[PDB]
Amino acid sequence: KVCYFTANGITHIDYKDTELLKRFISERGKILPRRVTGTSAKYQRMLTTAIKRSRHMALLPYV
Amino acid sequence: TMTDPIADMLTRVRNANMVRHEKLELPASNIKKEIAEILKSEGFIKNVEYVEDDKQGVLRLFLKYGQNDERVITGLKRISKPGLRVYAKASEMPKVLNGLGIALVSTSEGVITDKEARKRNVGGEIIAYVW
Amino acid sequence: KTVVRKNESLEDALRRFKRSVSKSGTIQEVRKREFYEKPSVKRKKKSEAARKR
RNA sequence: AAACUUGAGUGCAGAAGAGGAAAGUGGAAUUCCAUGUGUAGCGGUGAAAUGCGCAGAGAUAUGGAGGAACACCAGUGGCGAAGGCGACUUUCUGGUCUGUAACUGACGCUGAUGUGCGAAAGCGUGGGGAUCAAACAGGAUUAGAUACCCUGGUAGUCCACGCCGUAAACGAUGAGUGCUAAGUGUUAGGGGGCCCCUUAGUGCUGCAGCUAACGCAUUAAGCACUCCGCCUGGGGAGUACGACCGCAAGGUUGAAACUCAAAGGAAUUGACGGGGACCCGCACAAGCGGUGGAGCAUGUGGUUUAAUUCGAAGCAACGCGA
RNA sequence: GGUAAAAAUGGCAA
Ligand SMILES: [Mg+2]
Ligand SMILES: [Mg+2]
Ligand SMILES: [Mg+2]
Ligand SMILES: [Mg+2]
Ligand SMILES: [Mg+2]
Numbered sequence: 001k002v003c004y005f006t007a008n009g010i011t012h013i014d015y016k017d018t019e020l021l022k023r024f025i026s027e028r029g030k031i032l033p034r035r036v037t038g039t040s041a042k043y044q045r046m047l048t049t050a051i052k053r054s055r056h057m058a059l060l061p062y063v
Numbered sequence: 064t065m066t067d068p069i070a071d072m073l074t075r076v077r078n079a080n081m082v083r084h085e086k087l088e089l090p091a092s093n094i095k096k097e098i099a100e101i102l103k104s105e106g107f108i109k110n111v112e113y114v115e116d117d118k119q120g121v122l123r124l125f126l127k128y129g130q131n132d133e134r135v136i137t138g139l140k141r142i143s144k145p146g147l148r149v150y151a152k153a154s155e156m157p158k159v160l161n162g163l164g165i166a167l168v169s170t171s172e173g174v175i176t177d178k179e180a181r182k183r184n185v186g187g188e189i190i191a192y193v194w
Numbered sequence: 195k196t197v198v199r200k201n202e203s204l205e206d207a208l209r210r211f212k213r214s215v216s217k218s219g220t221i222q223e224v225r226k227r228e229f230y231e232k233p234s235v236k237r238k239k240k241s242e243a244a245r246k247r
Numbered sequence: 248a249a250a251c252u253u254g255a256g257u258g259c260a261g262a263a264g265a266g267g268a269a270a271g272u273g274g275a276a277u278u279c280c281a282u283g284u285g286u287a288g289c290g291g292u293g294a295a296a297u298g299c300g301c302a303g304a305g306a307u308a309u310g311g312a313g314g315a316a317c318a319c320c321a322g323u324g325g326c327g328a329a330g331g332c333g334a335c336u337u338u339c340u341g342g343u344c345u346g347u348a349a350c351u352g353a354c355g356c357u358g359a360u361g362u363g364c365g366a367a368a369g370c371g372u373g374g375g376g377a378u379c380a381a382a383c384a385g386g387a388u389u390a391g392a393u394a395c396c397c398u399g400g401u402a403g404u405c406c407a408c409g410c411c412g413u414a415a416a417c418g419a420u421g422a423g424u425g426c427u428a429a430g431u432g433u434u435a436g437g438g439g440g441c442c443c444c445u446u447a448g449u450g451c452u453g454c455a456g457c458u459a460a461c462g463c464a465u466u467a468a469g470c471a472c473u474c475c476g477c478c479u480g481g482g483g484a485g486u487a488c489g490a491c492c493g494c495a496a497g498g499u500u501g502a503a504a505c506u507c508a509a510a511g512g513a514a515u516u517g518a519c520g521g522g523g524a525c526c527c528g529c530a531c532a533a534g535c536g537g538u539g540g541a542g543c544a545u546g547u548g549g550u551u552u553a554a555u556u557c558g559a560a561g562c563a564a565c566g567c568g569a
Numbered sequence: 570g571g572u573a574a575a576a577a578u579g580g581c582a583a
């Protein structure tokens with residue numbers, strides 16, 4: 001697949017940007033693997049810290 | 064780090080010769096140029112070119128391969144080493160492959176072959192054997 | 195949560211339920227943590243299973 | 248003695264990271280405790296039982312307490328000298344890579360003795376204790392079962408500060424440097440037109456060369472030079488003694504008498520397996536009729552005898568030579 | 570996911 005962040009020229013992921021993050025999480029709230037999404041290695045790391053930060057602030061669910 | 068530039072030169076020649084490369088390039092030094100000149104003079108190598116580089120210079124050696132791709136240089140060996148220096152007297156000068164090969168000797172009369180050393184009756188450090 | 199659709203069989207709903215459970219992978223997780231596997235063993239299983247994948 | 252910039256550093260501009268230390272903040276789950284609903288089991292195994300429950304268990308709902316570990320992400324992915332390091336946040340702090348070419352100008356490499364770090368178990372002092380779990384106790388299995396399996400369960404597992412100093416601490420591969428076909432994936436960059444080139448890692452495949460063979464192969468076990476550590480048949484023995492270190496456990500160093508002609512590595516052909524695949528055969532299954540029990544015939548063993556002639560001995564001797 | 574449980578021993582030569 002294609003990396004969204006590379007394609008759309010997004011270099012920073014905000015944990016506060018819930019709408020973006022919801023696309024990269026499953027229906028159970030599980031973080032999606034980068035194979036399925038097509039996210040790059042560098043951005044899988046960025047996104048994932050953001051999801052964990054968002055879950056801390058109850059913007060996104062743990063489950 | 065690099066400890067024996069001469070030994071490196073001979074290994075580069077050995078490695079390129081094994082794979083039958085036409086030419087090889089190495090960092091230059093006065094001793095390495097002299098060794099190269101003897102090899103051309105003795106017919107082991109075709110040609111030696113020197114290129115100024117603003118560092119230490121570059122030597123380009125062209126290797127000789129006989130008909131049927133037979134290699135003119137069969138082997139090279141470093142004799143005197145940084146770990147153990149080897150010297151010989153003119154009387155004791157070694158013959159390599161019973162005169163079929165050569166020994167490169169550093170003498171007060173310059174870097175020369177074993178034959179010249181016996182002729183001039185001057186001994187010195189045995190740099191390498193080439194056969 | 196699978197919810198039975200209007201004019202849909204409970205058995206048909208059961209098919210949907212089974213598939214959702216499979217995607218969740220809750221069954222997969224349960225089996226892994228039945229017995230303790232030493233740290234080195236866990237790492238090996240992760241690698242070779244990925245090698246299969 | 249005087250130069251030089253290629254090695255090695257420094258500056259400058261970028262890059263990624265579970266590198267380390269200390270605070271703080273989460274969510275899932277386990278255990279326990281408290282109540283509500285509710286009922287005759289639950290739990291466990293090959294099968295059981297011990298156990299738990301009927302003094303209301305288990306289950307279900309809600310609340311509280313506490314400890315430990317951080318699903319997904321997650322990848323021959325990343326980082327670190329090694330041991331190791333995986334929730335998130337902040338503070339302090341180490342290293343590495345790319346580009347550039349300001350600067351310094353061989354300032355380097357290795358490294359005995361030293362000196363530090365060093366999984367796990369263990370030890371000391373204090374704290375903590377959810378889970379798991381040596382010892383230990385039941386239950387079971389068994390010829391026995393000081394085990395495997397089951398129900399429990401203490402140290403320990405956790406934290407702090409000291410000690411210990413060892414692991415198949417492994418890539419069973421010391422460090423440095425250069426050189427030697429390719430193909431393909433991936434991590435962090437750089438450059439030029441998705442493609443090409445390039446730097447440093449990390450995998451797979453594969454020449455030359457190497458190797459006893461297996462294999463290794465620019466991440467060499469190839470070709471070379473420097474320095475260090477280490478080996479010289481097996482056992483006795485990593486034992487004894489001495490020394491040093493340790494609270495202890497032990498660690499480090501480390502023989503000999505005596506004894507043997509072998510120990511070993513790799514590969515090959517077989518055989519075998521409570522290994523696998525695929526196939527058969529009255530092998531089993533599905534059936535029918537028997538033998539083993541009775542009387543008798545006959546062979547054999549044994550015993551007996553003057554002699555009980557000799558031969559056959561699991562299947563493949565025993566109504567067999569006859 | 571499984572899994573049936575138990576399942577000991579056998580002189581050195583040639
Ligand atoms: Mg410990
Ligand atoms: Mg137990
Ligand atoms: Mg050791
Ligand atoms: Mg590479
Ligand atoms: Mg009868």
Ligand SMILES: [Mg+2]
């Ligand atoms: Mg036997």
